[PDB]
Amino acid sequence: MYKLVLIRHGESTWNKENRFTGWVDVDLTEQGNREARQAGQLLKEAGYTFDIAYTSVLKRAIRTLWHVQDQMDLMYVPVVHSWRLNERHYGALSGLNKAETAAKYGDEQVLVWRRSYDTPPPALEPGDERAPYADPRYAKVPREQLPLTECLKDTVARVLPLWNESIAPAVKAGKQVLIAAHGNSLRALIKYLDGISDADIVGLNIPNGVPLVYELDESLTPIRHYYLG
Ligand SMILES: O=[P-]([O-])[O-]
């Protein structure tokens, strides 16, 4: 039997401002820093340790990981930063206030853009300042693999290779793994782990900064899961 711990980044500036974020590299609020430290303290007091961690290339998740590491006295473990764990790409919605958007386009249209498993937000133009092509984070990524928008389906497809190629072999090698990531990239990973239907995944929400523990059997199939706290 194995344990895997997942954690969503603490409150970001745009979470506070109610803006769609996606791949925009915004940072934690004071609250979010607090949440991350509390999560690290909660794992420390429960006796968890880790041998490796996975995160995105986005600072809100990385700083969350840093606070956890600092509270646990785990500043030295290897960390794999992967674009594959980035938040779902919000396209031309990135940066817009969610309430303003719903007023302009309607509540239903926004709920389709936010939670339709299969229908993506309107795309960035390839010339937009928000596009990923000139960002050093993505300099070794095939141009054709870089998104201009994503639905959860695309996010699931992007997350899986990192699971199959790196995280699952670590878990099988006996490494105690922590994944510090994002609301929709953790929804996507959960969807895969728990074998959740396209319909059923629509109502799953992940709070900021709360450890989510998975117990996994010999074939890495979930036995049970629970939040700590
Ligand atoms: O707001 P977040 O889950 O990237």
Numbering used by the authors: 1 to 229
The authors write:
The enzyme 2,3-bisphosphoglycerate-dependent phosphoglycerate mutase (PGAM) catalyzes the interconversion of 3-phosphoglycerate and 2-phosphoglycerate, a key step in the glycolytic pathway. PGAM converts 3-phosphoglycerate to 2-phosphoglycerate through a ping-pong mechanism in which a phosphoenzyme transfers a phosphate group from an active-site histidine to 3-phosphoglycerate to form a 2,3-bisphosphoglycerate intermediate that subsequently transfers the phosphate from the 3-position to yield the 2-phospho­glycerate product and a reconstituted phosphoenzyme. As a key enzyme in glycolysis and energy metabolism, PGAM is a potential target for novel antibiotics. Here, we present six X-ray crystal structures of an additional Gram-negative bacterial PGAM from Burkholderia pseudomallei bound to various ligands.
The small molecule 2-l-phosphoserine was selected from the Fragments of Life library (Emerald BioStructures) based on its structural similarity to 3-d-phosphoglycerate. Both 2-phosphoserine and 3-­phosphoglycerate share a secondary carboxylate group and a phosphate linkage. The key differences between the two small molecules are that they have inverted chirality at the C2 atom and serine has an amino group in place of a hydroxyl. PGAM tolerates binding of this nonsubstrate molecule, probably owing to the nearly unchanged relative positions of the phosphate and carboxylate moieties, which are highly coordinated by the active-site residues Thr21, Gly22, Tyr90, Lys98, Arg114 and Arg115. The replacement of the secondary hydroxyl by a secondary amine is expected to make 2-­phosphoserine unreactive with PGAM and the fragment is expected to be an inhibitor. Also of note in the 2-phosphoserine structure is the unusual structure of the phosphorylated histidine residue His9. The bond angles between the phosphate O atoms, the central P atom and His9 N∊2 are close to 90° and the P—N∊2 distance is long for a nitrogen–phosphorus bond at ∼2 Å. Unlike the β-phosphoglucomutase structure, where there is an ∼2 Å distance between the P atom and both the enzyme nucleophile and the substrate leaving group, there is a very long (>3.8 Å) distance between the P atom and the nearest atom of the 2-phosphoserine. The inclusion of two metabolite-like fragment structures in the ensemble (2-phosphoserine and malonate) provides starting points for elucidating ligand-binding flexibility and potential for small-molecule inhibitor design.
